Design a protein around this ligand. Structure first.
Ligand SMILES: O=P(O)(O)OC[C@H]1O[C@@H](O)C[C@@H](O)[C@@H]1O
Ligand SMILES: O=P(O)(O)OC[C@H]1O[C@@H](O)C[C@@H](O)[C@@H]1O
Ligand SMILES: OC[C@H]1O[C@@H](O)[C@H](O)[C@@H](O)[C@@H]1O
Ligand SMILES: OC[C@H]1O[C@@H](O)[C@H](O)[C@@H](O)[C@@H]1O
Ligand code: NA
Ligand code: NA
Length: 899
């Protein structure tokens, strides 16, 4: 008995006490917290990787798929087919392919071309090639994942080292391999660790399974953690499976007091020197060689075989984990020991067979004990999560060692239940391997992949290519010609209306002017005092007056009576009642003008629909309201479009400015055109500012090409169906409605909001410019996005908030690009007008969508640069409004009136 009580002291360091295993467990409990926290995760050795699997199979899984399995003892390819609907119990066929060491050690090309060739064969053996079966992929290696169908290899472990893989996406790699063959197609829909595949396989049968355990070639475990603990994943709703990759436990010296001279030597001879240290004490790829190393030592010290030693006893890997298991069998161990020890050359004595069988015990007992230490920590985490005074869960298991060693399972279960007896645990053992749990993962993945595909399909229609945009640019330019030319003008949709402003501020303007700003979001009256000379100044005041629902749609007389009434109040407000003042009237609507002071309303746009206004001269209508009140008297000198007012405002200080752009409630533009080109106004000397009214672009159908189902709905339900189509794809009054319709369709399709179309969501105008701008802000936490949505009255989840955000982006982006194509055409026509090769020009811009949106102006400028590369455009934001420009225009008006 001394021959045994002696080994017990020699391999003393490889016998851990419960006191010890407790310290280990405590330490792994910490490693978990560090792996999960976003602050320390990058330093932690236990990666606690997110798997993107939300829960064990429930039964609703259904379909037919192919599963791959690489990284374990054998490279297997399965096929899991199941429909409960047709009442078709889970069914599955599998197979194994030989993969020579030269492949597992060659280039990724070799390895993945190999896997691709085997998948080919496997499919050419059932003729399931033409079947669009979803492929699942079990990859037993640590992987970086941001989505279930992405797997960036962090590092090879166990027996694999293939060049050109670490850091790449094995998904893209396999796809490439297959592609090169063109032998068939394959939709890799998911990738999971074998721990995860195992947890899913067992969960299917045991709805309490919350853990996955692999003790085969290598060791590793996964568990269901609370999303409120997974710092590295946006969300708190529910739970997700974490792949601990605990093999790396202690790769940073953590376990330098547990590791022995033996562990260090096997390491110095291993494939991954320094890494997977905890694992190198456990998995069945090392145990055999650990024993051999211990036996070489003892032998060298004469503790065995008379101190005899052969070349075989010194050869790496002559001792298998098989032999370790074969020696530990109850009835036959010593017999086997003899045989194995005899093949080794040494002269095995019945005593040697007893010592060796004991080294195997100490070594195998330790592996199981360690996995107990760590698993005990996982359970401690679960119980803590639940809060229950007693954990009651199930642990899935798989792996050659655990499956074949006649003493391992037995010993391990006992140690664990002892370290954490405050819990009743069941150890369900996989029998299908991973196929089942894996295919159950693929089912869900594919499901979600299909929705996603339909989504991208719909949103794809909103994507415009460089060439598409250049077409839009070209069409815009053509429509411009049609509008300017007297022959085609009457039918042209882009009216190219003359403003009668012939030049930008010349610096002589001087005086006091009243002003009106009508058509934007805020109607106001202004007082503008301009002083020219050496020391030139501008001083303005204004007041916003609200316009009531009745009035805005109502009778012209009503509307202009309200306006004049507001003018009256403002006069009192400014303490200036009674002098006859010159008035500049900014009226943001298409007007046919025969002079600066006459404007006939061509048609209402945006939200305005007063009766008996269209066809009338708005200056007359105003003069009447002034007459009718008979309080004060004004001298209305000019009517001006906000575009033109904006250009003039910005020209005041920036003489390079010759273009006006508005992107607010509506969208429109203006620019300085050569009189020789304005065929609608007699004369060919100098210039004329042209109010384009480009919102009407597309009204003749020249954009049916790119308008979508959602664009048509918005147009069709608007106050002006069939009109202002281009603007309805750009401005703040409409973008939201477009988005709203997209969402209504997605909800009906079941992609959003659980498929329930809220009353709120059926309220038109819900997505105001302000909301859109907030929703698209950068580095904005989903929690914040979801908050904004609940504010509007939309009860949404993280996934919803994400989809909504994507939709808003697609729409606002398209708007910025379409707007860019228009401006691109404009600046290019100017460049030509001046016969330049390169033109520097600046644009005066105003509008709420333009000011508030965090991407619009940017994408718009970018687009203008790309489409008109021979122009360098500068966009200058107007911060005052139109008052200055309107005033500057009114000044020249007076100089012509008093002329
Ligand atoms: O074959 P081993 O590496 O010993 O054990 C681990 C393997 O178990 C197999 O039943 C399924 C594989 O997904 C897993 O990787
Ligand atoms: O109010 P929005 O329609 O967003 O922006 C357009 C408005 O911008 C205002 O600063 C000046 C108005 O002349 C113009 O109509
Ligand atoms: O296959 C068993 C385990 O081996 C470990 O070395 C790998 O890092 C894990 O991905 C895997 O779960
Ligand atoms: O307010 C911005 C633009 O809105 C368009 O709908 C109007 O018809 C234009 O006259 C105006 O410049
Ligand atoms: Na989280
Ligand atoms: Na002309």
């Amino acid at each position: 008995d001394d021959q045994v009580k002696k080994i017990d002291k020699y391999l003393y360091a490889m016998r851990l006490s419960d006191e010890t295993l407790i310290d280990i467990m405590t330490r792994f409990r910490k490693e978990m917290k560090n792996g999960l926290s976003r602050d320390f995760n990058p330093t932690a050795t236990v990666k606690m990787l997110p798997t993107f699997v939300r829960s064990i199979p429930d039964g609703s899984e259904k379909g037919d798929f192919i599963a791959l399995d690489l990284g374990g003892s054998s490279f297997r390819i399965l096929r899991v087919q199941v429909n409960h609907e047709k009442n078709q119990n889970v069914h599955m066929e599998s197979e194994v392919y030989d993969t020579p060491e030269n492949i597992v050690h060659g280039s990724g090309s070799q390895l993945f071309d190999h896997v691709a060739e085997c998948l080919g064969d496997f499919m050419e053996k059932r003729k399931i090639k033409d079947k669009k079966l979803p492929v699942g992929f079990t990859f037993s290696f640590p992987c970086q994942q941001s989505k279930i169908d992405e797997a960036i290899l962090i590092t090879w472990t166990k027996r694999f080292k293939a060049s050109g893989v670490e850091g790449a996406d094995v998904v893209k790699l396999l796809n490439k391999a297959i592609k090169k063959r063109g032998d068939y197609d394959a939709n890799i829909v998911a990738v999971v660790n074998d721990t995860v595949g195992t947890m899913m396989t067992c969960g299917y049968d045991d709805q309490h399974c919350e853990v996955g355990l692999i003790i085969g070639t290598g060791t590793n475990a996964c568990y269901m953690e609370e999303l409120r603990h997974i710092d590295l994943v946006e969300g708190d709703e529910g739970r997700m499976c974490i792949n601990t990759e605990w093999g790396a436990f202690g790769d940073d010296g953590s376990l330098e007091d547990i590791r022995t001279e033996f562990d260090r030597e096997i390491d110095r001879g291993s494939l991954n020197p320094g890494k997977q240290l905890f694992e190198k004490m456990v998995s069945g790829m090392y145990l055999g060689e650990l024993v051999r190393l211990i036996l070489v030592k003892m032998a060298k010290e004469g503790l065995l075989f008379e101190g005899r030693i052969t070349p075989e006893l010194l050869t790496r890997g002559k001792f298998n984990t098989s032999d370790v298991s074969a020696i530990e069998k109850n009835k036959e161990g010593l017999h086997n020991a003899k045989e194995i020890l005899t093949r080794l050359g040494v002269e095995p004595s019945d005593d040697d067979c007893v010592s060796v069988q004991h080294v195997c015990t100490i070594v195998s007992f330790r592996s199981a004990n360690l996995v107990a230490a760590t698993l005990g920590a996982i359970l401690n985490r679960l119980r803590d999560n639940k809060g229950t005074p007693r954990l009651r869960t199930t642990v899935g298991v798989d792996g050659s060692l655990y499956k074949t060693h006649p003493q391992y399972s037995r010993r391990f279960h006992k140690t664990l239940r002892r370290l954490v007896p405050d819990s009743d645990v069941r150890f369900l053992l996989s029998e299908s391997g991973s196929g089942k749990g894996a295919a159950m993962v693929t089912a869900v993945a594919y499901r979600l992949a299909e929705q996603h595909r339909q989504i991208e399909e719909t949103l794809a229609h909103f994507h415009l290519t460089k060439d598409m945009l250049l077409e839009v640019k070209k069409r815009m330019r053509a429509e411009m010609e049609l509008g300017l030319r007297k022959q085609t003008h009457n039918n042209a949709v882009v009216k190219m209306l003359p403003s009668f402003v012939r030049r930008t501020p010349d610096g002589t303007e001087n005086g006091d002017f009243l002003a009106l700003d009508l058509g934007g979001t805020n109607f106001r009256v202004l007082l503008v005092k301009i002083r020219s000379g050496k020391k030139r100044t501008v001083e303005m005041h204004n007041k916003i007056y609200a316009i009531p629902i009745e009035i805005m749609q109502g009778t012209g007389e009503e509307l202009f009576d309200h306006i004049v009434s507001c003018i009256s109040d403002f006069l009192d407000y400014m303490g200036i009642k009674g002098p006859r003042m010159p008035l500049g009237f900014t009226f943001s609507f298409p007007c046919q003008q025969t002079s600066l002071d006459a404007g006939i309303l061509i048609t209402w746009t945006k939200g305005f629909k007063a009766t008996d206004c269209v066809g009338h001269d708005v200056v007359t209508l105003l003069r009447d309201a002034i007459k009718r009140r008979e309080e004060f008297d004004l001298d209305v000198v000019a009517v001006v479009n906000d575009t033109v007012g904006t250009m003039m405002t910005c020209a005041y200080e920036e003489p390079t400015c010759e273009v006006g752009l508005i992107v607010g409630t509506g969208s429109n533009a203006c620019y300085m055109e050569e009189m020789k080109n304005v065929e609608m106004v007699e004369g060919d000397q100098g210039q004329m500012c042209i109010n384009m009214e480009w919102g009407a672009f597309g009204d003749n159908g020249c954009l049916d090409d790119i308008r979508t189902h959602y664009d048509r709905l918005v147009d069709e339900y608007s106050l002006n169906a069939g009109k202002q189509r281009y603007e309805k794809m750009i401005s703040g009054m409409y973008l939201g409605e477009i988005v709203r319709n997209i969402l209504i369709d997605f909800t009906k399709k079941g992609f959003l909001f659980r498929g329930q179309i809220s009353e709120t969501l059926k309220t038109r105008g819900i997505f105001e410019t302000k909301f859109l701008s907030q929703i698209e802000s950068d580095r904005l936490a989903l929690l914040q996005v979801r908050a904004i949505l609940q504010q509007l009255g939309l009860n949404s989840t993280c996934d919803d908030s994400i989809l909504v955000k994507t939709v808003c982006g697609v729409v606002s982006r398209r708007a910025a690009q379409l707007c860019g194509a228009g401006m691109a055409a404009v600046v290019d026509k100017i460049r030509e007008n001046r016969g330049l090769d390169r033109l520097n020009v600046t644009v005066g811009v105003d509008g709420t969508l333009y000011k508030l949106h965090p991407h619009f102006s940017r994408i718009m400028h970018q687009t203008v640069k790309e489409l008109s590369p021979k122009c360098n455009v500068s966009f200058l934001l107007s911060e005052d409004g139109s008052g200055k420009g309107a005033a500057l225009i009114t000044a020249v008006g007076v100089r012509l009136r008093t002329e």
